[PDB]
Amino acid sequence: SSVQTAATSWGTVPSIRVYTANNGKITERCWDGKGWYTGAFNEPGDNVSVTSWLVGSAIHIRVYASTGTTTTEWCWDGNGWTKGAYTATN
Ligand SMILES: OC[C@@]1(O)OC[C@@H](O)[C@@H](O)[C@@H]1O
Numbered sequence: 001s002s003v004q005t006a007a008t009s010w011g012t013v014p015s016i017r018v019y020t021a022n023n024g025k026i027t028e029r030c031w032d033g034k035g036w037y038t039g040a041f042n043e044p045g046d047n048v049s050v051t052s053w054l055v056g057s058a059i060h061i062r063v064y065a066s067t068g069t070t071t072t073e074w075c076w077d078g079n080g081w082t083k084g085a086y087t088a089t090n
């Protein structure tokens, strides 16, 4: 019924990313210290989770988008979103 969210953050500002699964689609809202805005992530999914990590000054984000029993990993590594290698046999 209600939307389903996942959130991650990094640094001291901080930067925050909030992913919302709604009606089969996952979108992204972003905060970098100035106000909330809509991010570049939009992919199919009924469920979302996220994790992120820093390597020095580089942020790496992994978003896990699921529809049915299939989970697709999406990867941010500084140069746009790319499909990750994650697989599972659910
Ligand atoms: O604009 C900020 C942005 O580039 O930050 C990294 C990712 O969260 C992207 O989806 C997002 O658009």
Ligand SMILES: OC[C@@]1(O)OC[C@@H](O)[C@@H](O)[C@@H]1O
Binding pocket: 062, 073, 075, 077, 083, 084, 085, 086
């Ligand atoms: O750089 C992308 C990648 O290798 O990062 C680590 C894991 O998230 C993998 O599934 C993914 O393909």
